[PDB]
């Protein structure tokens, strides 16, 4: 897997974001996670966590996995990093997302994330409280 540059266009919610990638605007959906919807419990907290993490980053990177890079809605599917720190993992580690949508061949960081979720749940963080 390889990290590639991108720039924030606009935060959207917990697990989607509008980025410019290879010079083109594109909505990205974070791999391997599910945050609550904005109108659901912890949904505004997820949105807020992702917004700050990206808006504060001096450097955003996109990391595609081995399989599908685009979902059926045209959303880019990637691991997203903010100053070298993975947003997907950080959401899970804070109990602001569940590990989810783990499809064969786009699952490189599954075990890293499941270990974050385990710790989140142990600490009864947020969704696990
Ligand atoms: C995260 C992810 C979602 N999607 C699809 C599955 C779900 O389809 P349906 O819309 O038919 O339920 C939807 C979940 O996205 P959201 O969690 O953003 O709704 O996106 C993928 O196809 N691949 C993925 O890696
Ligand atoms: Ca969601």
From Swiss-Prot:
Residues 109-125 have a biased composition (Basic and acidic residues). The active site is at 29, 37, 75. It is found in: Secreted. Residues 109-129 are annotated as: Disordered. Ca(2+) binds at residues 15, 34-35. This is Nuclease A. It comes from Staphylococcus aureus. The gene is nuc. The chain holds residues 89 to 223 of 231 of the full protein.
């Amino acid at each position: 897997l390889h990290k590639e540059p991108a720039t924030l266009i606009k935060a959207i919610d917990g697990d989607t974001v509008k980025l410019m990638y290879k010079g083109q605007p594109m909505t990205f959906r974070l791999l391997l996670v599910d945050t609550p919807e904005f109108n659901e419990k912890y949904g505004p907290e997820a949105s807020a966590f992702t917004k700050k993490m990206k808006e504060n980053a001096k450097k955003i990177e996109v990391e595609f996995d081995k399989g599908q890079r685009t979902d059926k809605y045209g959303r880019g599917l990637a691991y997203i990093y903010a100053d070298g720190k993975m947003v997907n993992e950080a959401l899970v580690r804070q109990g602001l997302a569940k590990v989810a949508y783990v499809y064969k061949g786009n699952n490189t960081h599954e075990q890293l994330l499941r270990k974050a979720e385990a710790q989140a749940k142990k600490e009864k963080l947020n969704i696990w409280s």
